[PDB]
Design a binder for these strands. Structure first.
Ligand code: OIY
Lengths: 155, 122, 79, 207, 130, 82
RNA sequence: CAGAAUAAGCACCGGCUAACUCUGUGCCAGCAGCCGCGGUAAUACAGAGGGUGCGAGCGUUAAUCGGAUUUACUGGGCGUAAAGCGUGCGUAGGCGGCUUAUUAAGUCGGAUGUGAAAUCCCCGAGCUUAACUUGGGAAUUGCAUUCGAUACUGGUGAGCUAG
RNA sequence: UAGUUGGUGGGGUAAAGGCCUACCAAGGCGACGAUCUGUAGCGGGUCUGAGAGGAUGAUCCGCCACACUGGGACUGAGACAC
């Protein structure tokens, strides 16, 4: 299980006499062969925040059906004001994406992809959109099963 | 916008304005120092900044900043000015090239000499 | 092997001449919606056969006047 | 131009032996400052590095091994990307196909710098002509030899003796008696050492 | 007023699928019947019926569900009365890398994009289905 | 009149001529009617030294084109070679 | 032929962005693309030491496109962030119900002619290599003529009633 | 917009033609932008961009126009002629 730390931020809460500071961490875990998840953690210190984020990421996982080491088809997804577009690429291309998309894709095991963000680039929302797109991407076997055809018929 | 509206009226594009209009699309410009004086910065800065008022060959009358420590410029000097903002002196949009025509190179420097126009000491 | 055009007569006042309006449908170069374009051609009518509103065929010829370089061939439909 | 200066500090900064010295004595005994950077603020290899730092430091290692400057290296990358196949493999094949590298791997030069000096001074003939360009690409079947005037040089005997200790490469077939070898084919990535991560250079240049 | 009956049919199908209906009915026409037949052949719907009680005619479509989700996840009108779209044989669109179907009206009848490519003809792109 | 002559291409001190049919009033390296071969005086190795299309050469000569002296010599050489 | 003999500089080291300390100065002198540094321990000013990136070059200024989905055709919006005319009627225009016959304008397909050369791209050839030169291809997404197809849109004739 | 749009007789040109002239008619262009006004040599191409687009028109090639500023014609196959 490879673990990646997308972002760490300091947040404040106002009380009488001053401010209480805390830290938030966003993490993505993945096996690298089709299983990936993400989570967030809040704590008064960075190590505890990262630990909580990793535990939440392990509790929130999905399974992704890749075509080799790339996507099955182009994907459009969005969460809130963040929109993402991902497209399969040939061998040797690599992962052409921003940091937030790159964490999720590398954790899921995608090796060749072209990706783009439109709208807001907030890390949590971008991770949400990429996660949803990867979850909703389909495969020829599922398409054939749902249509009642064969894979060769589907083409 | 609908397709018919796009056909009737297109998409307009707003032209951009240059941040250094006195150069008139040239990399540098010659000028004559009308004034050599000193100004104060805006908040939260405090210093005594060295500025000149220069009449350019383009026909404009602008203000330029003199960089480095120590300058020999006086009124009626002939200088070369390039682009560059100070951002703490209001209305100053150009820099004076040290060591070009009448501006002398800054002395006692040995780092970043190409800027400020100081030749290499032996 | 001559270039012909089919159109509607919109004027017949002048001697031996008619004004034919041609219509074509083309795609907009950028927005892709088919639009209507019209051109007005001056033709030659030796016997003033054509009238306003008829559908006529004209063909390219050598110049006959300052603005006329097409000649009427036949009246496909009469008003 | 061409880098002239201290060789061992480059190895210390890169963190690995760069074969800049001949190899009579091991790198550790030669430097006694390995495992530390060359600066007065130098640390061990365990310090944190950004992705940009990793990508940069990977390319610099290869450049310092092969003696290639930035513009020529960028041209090599562009040619490799244009040519079909694995880009890193193409880049490494292009680097190994250089004449000065081929002479060094033949063993007439104890160091790539010495081989480059020989090639520049026209001590080496390709096919049958006295070339003097280190960056000439060597093709399959080419024959490299030592010029007669350059034969009988104590540096050449020392270099071939050291090359005997060093592992003789598979893709080059060389006879040391008359000092002549044949380039058979481009080396493979598996034949090349595995510590090089060419993918880092690829992501660096692809940005 | 109602000016795109094909878009109306596609919208009715989409809303019925989102609402989990088993059957969707509408006024009928030969164009909608052809589109429904193409969908049935491709396996997105189950049955197509036409009831002709009088001068009026009603088209009925039986929808398909699989593992708790509708079979038709996306149906999108492409050519519209305000902007018609025509493509040649070399520029026929592909819907999510061939896992979907683009319905195309060609001079040889209504067919899918891959059928049109095989026949070497173009036409008007009616809709994308996936 | 119509002539067949050499148009100079190539690089400095390594000329490469195209054999062209053109009006004689045009510039040497400018407008021409038809290109019918090439000449490379400094060819070596596998490089082809001369190529002339004899059919088009004869066609234009019959039409009335006047070859220059060098082009006539090259045509004689090509005929001898073939 | 003689001899290492004739041949190395420029920018930067607070974050964006690879590379850190010491002296000097104390909101002064100064730096600065943006956020911002300097008011006595300044990794941000000046010098030095060290290092980093390039290298017969290195930096700055100017200019174009990009990043900018920041005029959004591909590819954006209008309750409160900028944005629905105060509300109707209506001219030009845009779009328009169902069935059927016909036409072939839009639409689609084939063939022919043309789309100069150079340039871009591919495989070769010659330059000691490379730049460069050059052979042949591919491409020039276009235009015109002519022959076909008739699902959809348009034209024409007839019919219908859910508007 | 009043030789302006068309027609007839005549002239004129290497050649069609209001190109010119005398009569006859009231025509011709325009919201698919006429008229007026600002700017500008055009193309093959060049730069950028994933593409669609945007910017550009040095050096090479094709076309056009000009030759101190305006108005003319001569000679000649060809000029209204650096
Ligand atoms: N919001 C607070 C609302 C407060 C409001 N005052 C309440 C009120 O007044 N009346 C109550 C009326 C409630 C209403 N009838 C039901 C309703 O809201 N339906 C819509 C919401 C569905 C559902 N409920 C939420 C949901 O499934 N989220 C998931 C979730 O976050 C996460 O996936 C998981 N599994 O964790 C993520 C992937 O990481 O995908 C999200 N999915 C999505 N993201 C996308 C996005 O944004 N756009 C487009 C589409 O793609 C979206 N789908």
């Amino acid at each position: 299980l490879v673990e990646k730390l997308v972002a760490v931020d300091r947040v404040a809460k106002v009380v009488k006499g001053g401010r209480i500071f805390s830290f938030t961490a966003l993490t993505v875990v993945g096996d690298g062969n089709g299983r990936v998840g993400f989570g967030r953690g809040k704590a008064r210190e960075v190590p505890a925040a990262i630990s909580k984020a990793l535990e939440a990421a392990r509790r929130n996982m999905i399974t992704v059906d890749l075509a080799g080491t790339t996507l099955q088809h182009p994907v459009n997804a969005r969460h809130g004001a963040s929109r993402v577009y991902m497209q399969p690429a040939s061998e040797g291309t690599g992962v052409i994406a921003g940091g937030a998309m790159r964490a999720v894709l590398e954790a899921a095991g995608v090796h060749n992809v072209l990706a783009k963000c439109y709208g807001s680039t907030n890390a949590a929302n971008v991770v949400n959109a990429t996660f949803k797109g990867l979850r909703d991407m389909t495969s020829p076997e599922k398409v054939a099963a749902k249509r009642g055809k064969s894979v060769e018929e589907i083409q | 916008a609908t397709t018919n509206q796009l056909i009737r009226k297109g998409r307009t594009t707003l032209v951009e304005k240059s941040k250094v209009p006195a150069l008139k699309a040239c990399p540098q410009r010659r000028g004559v120092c009308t004034r050599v004086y000193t100004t104060t910065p805006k908040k939260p800065n405090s210093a005594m900044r060295k500025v000149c008022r220069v009449r350019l060959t383009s026909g404009f009358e602008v203000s330029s900043y003199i960089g480095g420590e120590g300058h020999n410029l006086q009124e009626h000097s002939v200088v070369l000015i390039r682009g560059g903002r100070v951002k703490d002196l209001p209305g100053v949009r150009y820099h004076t090239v040290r060591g070009s025509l009448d501006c002398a190179g800054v002395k006692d420097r040995n780092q970043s000499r190409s800027k400020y126009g100081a030749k290499r000491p032996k | 092997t001559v270039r012909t055009l089919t159109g509607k007569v919109v004027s017949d006042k002048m001697d031996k001449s008619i004004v034919v309006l041609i219509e074509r449908r083309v795609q907009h170069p950028l927005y892709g919606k088919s639009i209507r374009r019209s051109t007005k051609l001056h033709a030659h009518d030796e016997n003033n056969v054509a009238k306003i509103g008829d559908v006529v065929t004209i063909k390219e010829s050598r110049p006959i006047s300052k603005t006329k370089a097409w000649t009427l061939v036949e009246v496909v439909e009469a008003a | 131009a061409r880098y002239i200066g201290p060789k061992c500090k480059l190895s210390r900064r890169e963190g690995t032996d760069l074969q800049l010295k001949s190899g009579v004595k091991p790198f550790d005994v030669k430097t006694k400052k390995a495992n530390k950077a060359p600066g007065q603020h130098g640390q061990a290899r365990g310090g944190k590095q950004s992705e940009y730092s990793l990508q940069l430091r990977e390319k610099q290692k290869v450049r310092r091994i092969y003696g290639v400057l930035e513009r020529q290296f960028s041209n090599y990358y562009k040619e490799a990307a244009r040519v079909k196949g694995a880009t890193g493999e193409n880049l490494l094949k292009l680097l190994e196909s250089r004449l000065d590298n081929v002479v060094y791997r033949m063993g007439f030069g104890s160091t790539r710098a010495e081989a480059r000096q020989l090639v520049s001074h026209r001590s080496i003939t390709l096919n049958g002509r006295r070339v003097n360009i280190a960056s000439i690409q060597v093709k399959a079947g080419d024959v490299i030899a030592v010029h007669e005037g350059a034969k009988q040089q104590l540096r050449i005997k020392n270099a071939i003796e050291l090359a005997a200790q060093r592992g003789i490469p598979a893709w080059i077939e060389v006879d040391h008696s008359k000092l002549e070898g044949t380039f058979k084919a481009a080396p493979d990535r598996s034949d090349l050492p595995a510590e090089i991560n060419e993918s880092l250079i690829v992501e660096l240049y692809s940005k | 007023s109602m000016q795109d009956t094909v878009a109306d049919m596609l919208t009715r199908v989409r809303n019925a699928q989102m609402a989990k209906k088993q059957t969707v009915s509408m006024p009928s026409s030969k164009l909608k019947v052809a589109i429904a037949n193409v969908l049935q052949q491709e396996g997105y719907i189950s049955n197509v019926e036409v009831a002709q009680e009088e001068t009026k005619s009603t088209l009925t479509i039986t929808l398909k569900y699989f593992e708790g989700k509708p079979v038709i996840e996306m149906v999108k009108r492409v050519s519209r009365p305000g902007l018609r779209q025509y493509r040649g044989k070399d520029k026929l669109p592909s819907v999510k890398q061939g896992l979907g179907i683009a319905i195309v009206s060609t001079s040889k009848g209504i067919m899918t994009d891959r059928a049109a490519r095989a026949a070497g003809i173009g036409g008007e792109v009616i809709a994308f289905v996936s | 009149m119509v002539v067949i002559r050499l148009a100079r291409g190539g690089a400095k001190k390594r000329p490469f001529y195209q054999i062209v049919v053109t009006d004689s009033r045009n510039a040497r390296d400018g407008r021409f009617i038809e290109r019918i071969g090439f000449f490379n005086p400094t060819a070596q190795g596998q490089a082809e030294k001369l190529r002339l299309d004899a059919d088009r050469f004869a066609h234009w000569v019959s039409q009335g084109a006047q070859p220059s002296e060098r082009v006539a010599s090259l045509a004689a050489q090509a005929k001898k070679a073939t």
